[PDB]
Amino acid sequence: VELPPEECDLFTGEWVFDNETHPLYKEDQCEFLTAQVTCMRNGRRDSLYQNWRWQPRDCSLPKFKAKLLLEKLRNKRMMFVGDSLNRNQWESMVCLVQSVVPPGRKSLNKTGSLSVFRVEDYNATVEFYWAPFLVESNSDDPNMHSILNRIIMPESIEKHGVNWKGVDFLVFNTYIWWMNTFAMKVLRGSFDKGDTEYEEIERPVAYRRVMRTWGDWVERNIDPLRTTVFFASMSPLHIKSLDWENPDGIKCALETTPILNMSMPFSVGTDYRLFSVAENVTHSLNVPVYFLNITKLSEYRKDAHTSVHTIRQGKMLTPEQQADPNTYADCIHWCLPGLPDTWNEFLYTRIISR
Ligand SMILES: *[C@@H]1O[C@H](CO)[C@@H](O[C@@H]2O[C@H](CO)[C@@H](O)[C@H](O)[C@H]2NC(C)=O)[C@H](O)[C@H]1NC(C)=O
Ligand SMILES: *[C@@H]1O[C@H](CO)[C@@H](O)[C@H](O)[C@H]1NC(C)=O
Ligand SMILES: *[C@@H]1O[C@H](CO)[C@@H](O)[C@H](O)[C@H]1NC(C)=O
Ligand SMILES: *[C@@H]1O[C@H](CO)[C@@H](O)[C@H](O)[C@H]1NC(C)=O
Ligand SMILES: *[C@@H]1O[C@H](CO)[C@@H](O)[C@H](O)[C@H]1NC(C)=O
Ligand SMILES: *[C@@H]1O[C@H](CO)[C@@H](O)[C@H](O)[C@H]1NC(C)=O
Ligand SMILES: [Ca+2]
Ligand SMILES: [Co+2]
Ligand SMILES: [Co+2]
């Protein structure tokens, strides 16, 4: 295994086709994949999206060996904290490590907000904690159905943070639920006091407030020598095919290859004001935080979304539904294997590097 230089920027590079190494697992090999993300089982027939690897400009990612990762995880906890895209990344990590773990020596247990995947022989866990805004919100139950009015408490994080203490590897995120409305709904008092009044705060201002509460929590509670902290940058959406100069497309649903032309400037609507807030706040802390800068590289992956090959309110989209991607395509979430496996190759690289 060849470790990159500390100074190699892992997030500047290009996508390279490599069906000799990628995907790092097959969909059928991973019994833990949920129906949301098993695109092939769900009817997708092209699989070239699985074959792409990310090649940094100045170095190679080291060959993924799950055993090396699991040795770094022996007697330790890795926890993904955040929204449904961090849950997508957690599912990927589960597949990546479980690839070498024999039957019976692994298990998944979901208890409320916390999902726990155990690897018995290593006494290792890969966990997901639902906190879509990081701070306390009215949307902190992962099994609550949709509401139109999401509300946050930007200075409240202690109750969530109790669940994060003692964890060895922490990967935080938060983005997609910031994007539903122009401004953010911010509670005046506290949910637990029955308060209901909120005001609307500008999206980046409320984000900065959240990131400051989070950073302070980190600074107070994390020992750098015990715990490595990561922050996964904004996972992009691909909802408008004109955004990558394909007006004849249908959202992300007709796309089976990445954007390859590096001289075509484009946007897919990512709110880079939040990216700057996150980049600054994470670099500004005493406790080091490795910023997983996955945004632009993920923007090229117009091909890797679940599209119509997924679920809706708990069941597979029908053939009739799948035939109308304009109405039913999900251009948020990602097929597994696929893009979030790359997000996890960055985590792996950093973990085996220390
Ligand atoms: C996040 O990653 C992107 C690339 O995926 C970085 O943008 C590139 O930065 C290099 C300089 O290191 C430029 O030469 C490239 O033109 C940029 N590429 C693109 C495609 O924009 C960005 O700098 C990274 N940001 C941080 C804060 O790490
Ligand atoms: C890999 O892709 C190439 C080009 O698309 C294809 O010809 C080949 O059959 C694939 N994989 C192999 C041979 O393992
Ligand atoms: C198993 O892993 C956990 C997670 O860090 C640790 O606290 C625990 O003490 C380990 N148990 C043994 C017997 O090593
Ligand atoms: C999952 O962990 C919980 C802790 O709340 C425990 O009570 C339960 O027995 C576990 N479930 C399974 C199926 O092992
Ligand atoms: C790459 O995009 C640029 C800018 O749109 C364009 O000039 C050029 O034709 C493209 N190259 C291709 C498709 O090879
Ligand atoms: C924060 O972010 C922007 C762009 O990423 C930068 O230009 C600005 O100087 C930064 N401010 C602080 C306080 O770091
Ligand atoms: Ca060597
Ligand atoms: Co090249
Ligand atoms: Co411990």
Opening angle at CA 244, ends 241 and 245, nearest 5:
85
Beta-carbon contacts of 345 under 8 Å, excluding residues fewer than 6 positions away, are 24, 54, 61, 64
Going by alpha carbons, the residue nearest to atom 11 of ligand 3 is: 75
Phi then psi dihedrals of residue 200, to 5 deg? -100, 120
Tell me how far CA of residue 22 lies from CA of 26, 184, 277, 310, 345, in angstroms. 9, 39, 33, 22, 12
Output Rg (C-alpha) for the chain, integer angstroms.
20
8 Å CB contact between 283 and 291: yes
Q: Is the CB of 279 under 6 A from ligand 6?
A: yes
What residue type is assigned to position 113 of the chain?
Answer: S
The domain of 273 spans 1-354
Instruction: Write out the two tokens for 152.
Output: 């946050």
CB atoms inside a 10 Å sphere around CB 18: 12
Tell me how far CA of residue 31 lies from CA of 26, 49, 81, 106, in angstroms. 10, 21, 23, 11
How many independent structural domains does the chain possess? 1
What residue type is assigned to position 258 of the chain?
Answer: P
Q: Is the CB of 264 under 6 A from ligand 5?
A: yes
CB atoms inside a 10 Å sphere around CB 340: 29
8 Å CB contact between 282 and 239: no
Q: How far apart are CA 202 and CA 189, in angstroms?
A: 18
Q: How far apart are CA 126 and CA 76, in angstroms?
A: 9
Ligand 9 centre to CA of 224 (Å) is 14
Closest to 309 in 3D by CA, of 253, 268, 258: 253
Ligand found nearest the CA of 17: 2
User: Which residue of the set 22, 84, 303, 309 is catalytic?
Assistant: 84
Ligand 4 centre to CA of 340 (Å) is 28
Which method was used?
X-ray
HEC readout, 222-279: CCCCCCEEEEECCCCCCCCHHHHCCCCCCCCCCCCCCCCCCCCCCCCCCCHHHHHHHH
Q: How far apart are CA 303 and CA 47, in angstroms?
A: 10
279 CA: nearest ligand 1 atom: 27
Q: Is the CB of 313 under 6 A from ligand 5?
A: no
HEC readout, the chain: CCCCCCCCCCCCEEEEECCCCCCCCCHHHCCCCCCCCCCCCCCCCCCHHHHEEEEECCCCCCCCCHHHHHHHCCCCEEEEEECHHHHHHHHHHHHHHHCCCCCCCEEEEEECCEEEEEEHHHCEEEEEEECCCCCEECCCCCCCCCCCCCEEECCCCHHHHHHHCCCCEEEECCCHHHCCCCEEEEECCCHHHCCCCEEEEEHHHHHHHHHHHHHHHHHHHCCCCCCEEEEECCCCCCCCHHHHCCCCCCCCCCCCCCCCCCCCCCCCCCCHHHHHHHHHHHHHCCCCEEEECCHHHHHCCCCCEEECCCEECCEECCHHHHCCHHHHCEEEEECCCCHHHHHHHHHHHHHHCC
What residue type is assigned to position 228 of the chain?
Answer: T
Instruction: Write out the two tokens for 68.
Output: 């090396």
Closest to 3 in 3D by CA, of 56, 79, 39: 56
Q: Is the CB of 107 under 6 A from ligand 5?
A: no
> For 314-325, b where at least 16 C-beta lie within 10 A, e where not — what string?
eebbeeeebeeb
8 Å CB contact between 266 and 244: yes
Q: How far apart are CA 52 and CA 291, in angstroms?
A: 22
Q: Is the CB of 75 under 6 A from ligand 3?
A: yes
112 CA: nearest ligand 4 atom: 5
Strand partners, 330: 307
Q: Does the annotation mark 333 as catalytic?
A: yes
User: Which residue of the set 22, 238, 305, 333 is catalytic?
Assistant: 333
Ligand 7 centre to CA of 170 (Å) is 29
What residue type is assigned to position 201 of the chain?
Answer: I
Closest to 215 in 3D by CA, of 167, 157, 176: 157
Distance of CA 263 to the CA centre of its chain: 27
Opening angle at CA 336, ends 27 and 118, nearest 5:
80
Closest to 197 in 3D by CA, of 206, 207, 187: 187
Q: How far apart are CA 84 and CA 88, in angstroms?
A: 6
264 CA: nearest ligand 5 atom: 2
The answer for 117, left when phi > 0, alpha when psi is -120 to 50, beta otherwise, is beta
Choosing from 72, 75, 169 the residue with most ligand 3 atoms within 8 A of its CB, the one to mutate for a pocket test is 75
Going by alpha carbons, the residue nearest to atom 20 of ligand 1 is: 296
Ligand 8 centre to CA of 300 (Å) is 15
Strand partners, 55: 14
Ligand 2 centre to CA of 49 (Å) is 13
Q: How far apart are CA 238 and CA 110, in angstroms?
A: 30
Q: How far apart are CA 39 and CA 43, in angstroms?
A: 6
285: exposed, middle or buried (C-beta count within 10 Å: 0-12, 13-18, 19+)? middle
Tell me how far CA of residue 121 lies from CA of 48, 64, 101, 327, in angstroms. 35, 20, 8, 46
Ligand 1 centre to CA of 59 (Å) is 15
Instruction: Write out the two tokens for 49.
Output: 């999206």
